[PDB]
Amino acid sequence: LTPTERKRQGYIHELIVTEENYVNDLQLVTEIFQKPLMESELLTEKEVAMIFVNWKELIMCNIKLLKALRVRKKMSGELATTLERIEKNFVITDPRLPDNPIIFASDSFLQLTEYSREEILGRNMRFLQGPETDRATVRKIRDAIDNQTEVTVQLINYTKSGKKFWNLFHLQPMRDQKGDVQYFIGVQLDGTEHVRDAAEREGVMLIKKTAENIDEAAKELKMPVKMIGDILSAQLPHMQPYIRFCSRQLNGAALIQQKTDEAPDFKEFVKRLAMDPRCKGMPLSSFILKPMQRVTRYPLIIKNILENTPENHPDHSHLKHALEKAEELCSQVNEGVREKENSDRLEWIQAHVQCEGLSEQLVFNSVTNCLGPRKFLHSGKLYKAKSNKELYGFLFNDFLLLTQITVFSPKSNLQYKMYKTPIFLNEVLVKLPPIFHISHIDRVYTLRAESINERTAWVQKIKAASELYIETEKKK
Numbered sequence: 375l376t377p378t379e380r381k382r383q384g385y386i387h388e389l390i391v392t393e394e395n396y397v398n399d400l401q402l403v404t405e406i407f408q409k410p411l412m413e414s415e416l417l418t419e420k421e422v423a424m425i426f427v428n429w430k431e432l433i434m435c436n437i438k439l440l441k442a443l444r445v446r447k448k449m450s451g452e453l454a455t456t457l458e459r460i461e462k463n464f465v466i467t468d469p470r471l472p473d474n475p476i477i478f479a480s481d482s483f484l485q486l487t488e489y490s491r492e493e494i495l496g497r498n499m500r501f502l503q504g505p506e507t508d509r510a511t512v513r514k515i516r517d518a519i520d521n522q523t524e525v526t527v528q529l530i531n532y533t534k535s536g537k538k539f540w541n542l543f544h545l546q547p548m549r550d551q552k553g554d555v556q557y558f559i560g561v562q563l564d565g566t567e568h569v570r571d572a573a574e575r576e577g578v579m580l581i582k583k584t585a586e587n588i589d590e591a592a593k594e595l596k597m598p599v600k601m602i603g604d605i606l607s608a609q610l611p612h613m614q615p616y617i618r619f620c621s622r623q624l625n626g627a628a629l630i631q632q633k634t635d636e637a638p639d640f641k642e643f644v645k646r647l648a649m650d651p652r653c654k655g656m657p658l659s660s661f662i663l664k665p666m667q668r669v670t671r672y673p674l675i676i677k678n679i680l681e682n683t684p685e686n687h688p689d690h691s692h693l694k695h696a697l698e699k700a701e702e703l704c705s706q707v708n709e710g711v712r713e714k715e716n717s718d719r720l721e722w723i724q725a726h727v728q729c730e731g732l733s734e735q736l737v738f739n740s741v742t743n744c745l746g747p748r749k750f751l752h753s754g755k756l757y758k759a760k761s762n763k764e765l766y767g768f769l770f771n772d773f774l775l776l777t778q779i780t781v782f783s784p785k786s787n788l789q790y791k792m793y794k795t796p797i798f799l800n801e802v803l804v805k806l807p808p809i810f811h812i813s814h815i816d817r818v819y820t821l822r823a824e825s826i827n828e829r830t831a832w833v834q835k836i837k838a839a840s841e842l843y844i845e846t847e848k849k850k
C-alpha cells in the first residue's frame with residue numbers, strides 16, 4: 375500500500391485508540407473520585423459541583439462518539455480488559471506512522487522499564503538501548519521490520535534509571551486479510567544473563583505464545599477502515615458541554631489546591647483515592663486538564679487524516695466539515711477560557727437565579743442557539759410602569775431575563791426568583807417615549823430604569839445585541 379493510504383489508516387486508528395483511553399479516563403474520575411467524594415460527607419453539595427461541574431455531560435458526549443466508532447470498527451469494549459489479562463511484558467507499535475510510534479504498552483512493561491505511559495506513547499522503542507547494547511543485534515531487528523517479518527533476538531536494554539537487563543525480545547507483525555502489516559508486536563522477556571539451550575528454548579515458546587494472544591486480542595483493531603469522517607462530522611457539533619467545563623476548569627483546579635492547604639483530612643482522603651492502579655500514580659488535579667487537552671487534540675488528528683485522504687475519496691468531504699466543526703468547537707472553548715470575568719458572572723447567576731417551569735433546564739454558562747458562547751451584558755433594577763413592580767433584570771447576548779429579588783459579590787448571597795419567560799432578542803424592538811419601551815410582537819413591555827444613564831445603558835445594549843442577533847440569523 376502507498377505511504378499516503380498507509381498513514382491514513384494509522385491516523386484513523388490514532389483517533390480511535392486515543393479516544394478509548396480518553397473516555398476510559400473520564401469514567402474513572404466518576405467511578406473512583408466523584409461518587410466517593412459525594413458519599414464521604416467531607417464536602418458540601420456546592421463545593422463538589424464547583425470542581426467536576428458538568429463532568430457527567432462530558433462523558434455522555436464522548437460515549438456516543440466512542441460507541442459510534444466501535445460499531446464502524448465492529449469492536450466490543452473488551453479490548454482494554456483483554457489486553458490487561460495478558461500479564462506479560464509487551465508493546466504495540468504502528469509502522470504506518472513516522473518512526474514507528476508506540477500505541478500501547480502493558481503494565482508489566484511500564485513497571486519493568488520504570489517509565490510511565492505518557493513518556494512512552496508516540497515515541498520510538500529505541501530508548502531502551504544503551505552503550506553495552508549490541509548494535510549488530512539491533513540491525514537484525516531493523517531488517518525484520520523493513521522486510522515485515524518476525525524475529526527473535528537477545529540484547530542488553532536499559533531502564534529509566536539505567537539498570538541493565540537482558541532482553542529476550544520477539545518481534546511479530548500483525549496483518550489483516552490482504553496480508554498488509556498494520557501493527558508490530560514486541561514481547562520482552564527480561565533476564566539477568568544470556569539464555570542458551572533449554573533456557574533459551576523455553577523463553578522463545580512463551581514470548582511467541584504471548585504474541586499470538588495479543589494478535590487475538592487486537593484482532594478487531596487490525597482491520598482497515600473505509601470511512602471515519604461521517605461519524606466525526608455528526609458528533610462534533612454535539613460537544614457543547616466542553617465550553618462550560620473548560621471555562622470553569624481553572625476555578626475548579628484552584629478549589630482543590632486551596633481546600634488541601636486548609637484541610638488535612640481532605641488531603642489524605644484524595645490521595646487514598648489515587649491509590650488506584652488505573653490512575654498510574656497520577657493525582658486528581660491532572661485529570662481535570664484532560665478535557666481541555668482532548669478538544670485541542672481533535673483538529674490535529676482530523677487534519678492528519680484529511681491530508682492523507684484523496685479528493686475523489688468519499689470520506690474527503692466529511693473530513694472537511696469535521697475539521698471545521700472541530701476548529702469551531704476549539705475556538706469557542708478558547709473564548710470561554712479567555713473571558714474569565716464573563717464566566718464567573720454566568721455561573722453566579724446560575725446559583726442565585728431559580729429558573730423553574732421551563733421545557734429544558736436553563737444553563738447560563740453555556741452555548742446559545744446561534745451566537746455561540748453566552749455573554750452577560752447588563753443588569754440592574756427595572757420598574758414595570760403602571761404597576762411599579764420592583765424587578766431585577768439580567769441582559770444576555772441572546773435573551774433578557776426578568777427576575778424578582780426575594781451584585782456579583784462572592785460573599786453577598788441574594789436569591790432571585792424567575793419572573794417571566796426569558797425574552798429572546800430576536801423578536802424585540804426598542805424605542806423611547808427613566809422610562810423605556812421594548813416592543814415584543816405579542817405584548818408591549820413598559821419598564822423604568824434606576825436613572826437616565828441607566829435607561830440609555832439598557833436601550834443601547836439591548837438594541838445592539840438585538841441587531842447582532844437578527845443579522846446573524848440572516849446569514850443562514
Ligand SMILES: Cc1cc2nc3c(=O)[nH]c(=O)nc-3n(C[C@H](O)[C@H](O)[C@H](O)COP(=O)(O)O)c2cc1C
Pocket residue numbers: 465466467474498499500502503512515516519529531541543545558559560561562
Ligand atoms: C513492536 C516493537 C518492539 C520493539 N521492542 C524493542 C525492545 O524492547 N528493545 C530494543 O532495543 N528495541 C526494540 N524494538 C526496535 C526499535 O524500536 C528500533 O526499531 C530498533 O532499535 C532499530 O532502531 P533504528 O531504526 O534507529 O536503527 C522494537 C521494535 C518494535 C517494532
